[PDB]
A paper describes a structure:
Aβ fibrils extracted from tg-APPArcSwe mouse brain tissue harbor the Arctic mutation (E693G, E22G in Aβ) and have a crossover distance of ~950 Å and a diameter of 90 nm. The fibrils, which we refer to as murineArc type I Aβ fibrils, consist of two identical S-shaped protofilaments that are related by a pseudo-21 symmetry. The 3 Å-resolution map of murineArc type I Aβ fibrils allowed for atomic model building of the ordered core from G9–V40, in agreement with an observed predominance of Arctic Aβ40 fibrils in the sample. The S-shaped domain is formed by residues F19–V40, with an associated extended N-terminal arm of G9–V18 that interacts with the C-terminus of the opposing protofilament. The S-shape is stabilized by two hydrophobic clusters around F19, F20, V24 and I31 and around A30, I32, M35 and V40. The interface between the two protofilaments consists mainly of hydrophobic interactions involving the side chains of Y10, V12, Q15, L17, V36 and V39 at the contact point of the N-terminus of one protofilament and the C-terminus of the opposing protofilament. The fibril center harbors a hydrophobic cavity between the two C-terminal domains of both protofilaments, where two isolated symmetric densities can be observed indicating the presence of additional hydrophobic molecules of unknown identity in the interface. MurineArc type I fibrils resemble human type I Aβ42 filaments, which are dominant in extracts from the brain tissues of patients with SAD. In detail, the solvent-accessible surface is almost identical to human type I Aβ42 filaments but the C-terminus is slightly shifted, probably caused by the bound molecules in the hydrophobic fibril cavity. Additionally, and in contrast to APPNL-G-F Aβ filaments, in which the mutant residue G22 is hidden in the protofilament interface, the G22 in murineArc type I Aβ fibrils is exposed to solvents similarly to E22 in human type I filaments.
Numbering used by the authors:
A (entry chain F), B (entry chain H), C (entry chain J), D (entry chain D), E (entry chain B), F (entry chain I), ...: 9 to 40
The structure:
Amino acid sequence: GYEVHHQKLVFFAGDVGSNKGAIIGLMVGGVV
Amino acid sequence: GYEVHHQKLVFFAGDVGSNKGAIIGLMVGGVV
Amino acid sequence: GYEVHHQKLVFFAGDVGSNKGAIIGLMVGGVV
Amino acid sequence: GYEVHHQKLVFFAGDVGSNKGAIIGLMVGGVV
Amino acid sequence: GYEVHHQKLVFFAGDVGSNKGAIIGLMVGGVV
Amino acid sequence: GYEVHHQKLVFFAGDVGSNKGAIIGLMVGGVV
Amino acid sequence: GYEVHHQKLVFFAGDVGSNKGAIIGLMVGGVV
Amino acid sequence: GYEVHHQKLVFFAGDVGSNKGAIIGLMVGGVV
Amino acid sequence: GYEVHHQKLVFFAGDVGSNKGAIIGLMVGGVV
Amino acid sequence: GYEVHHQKLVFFAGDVGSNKGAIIGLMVGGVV
């Protein structure tokens, strides 16, 4: 018997005002 | 017997005002 | 017996005002 | 018998005003 | 019998005003 | 001036003999 | 001037014989 | 002037014989 | 002038014979 | 002028025979 529930994975749980930059989850190299 | 439920995966659970930038989940290289 | 339900995958669960930028799920290279 | 529940993984649980920089989860190299 | 619950992993549980820098979870090399 | 090239993203760069299991890129929940 | 190149992201760079198990990149919950 | 190159991210750079278990990159909860 | 190169991130650089267990990069909770 | 190169991050640089246990990079809670 296996009971698995209610897992979650959020990257950004909130509110942003005036995002002029970068919100990136996974980057390899590159220039921001 | 297997019971799996209520998993979730969100990247951005929230509200944005005036997004002038970048909201990226997975980038490889490149310039923001 | 297998019981799997109520999984979900959202990228952007919220509201945006004046999106002048980029909202990208998965990019490989390239210039924003 | 296995009972696993209510795990979570957030990167950013909060609110940002005027994000002019970078919010990156996992970077390899590159210039910010 | 196994009972595991309510684990969590946050990187940034708080609010930022005027982020002009970098908030990075895991970097290998590179220039900030 | 922007010069971005030669990015790549592979999940499985190799050879498999007698795959009787599962090779999955991104799963949410469920039983293997 | 921006010069970004030759980034890569592999999950499995190699060879497998007789895969009877699971090779998963990103799982949320669930039973293997 | 920005010069970024030759970044890489591998999870499994090698060979496996008789994989009867699990090779998982990122799991949240669940039973192996 | 910025010169960044040859960064890498491997989790498993080697060979496995008869993997009957678990090779997991990042787990939150759960039973192995 | 910035010159950064040849950084690396490995978790397991070697070979395993008969892995019947667990090889985990980062766990929060849970039972092995």
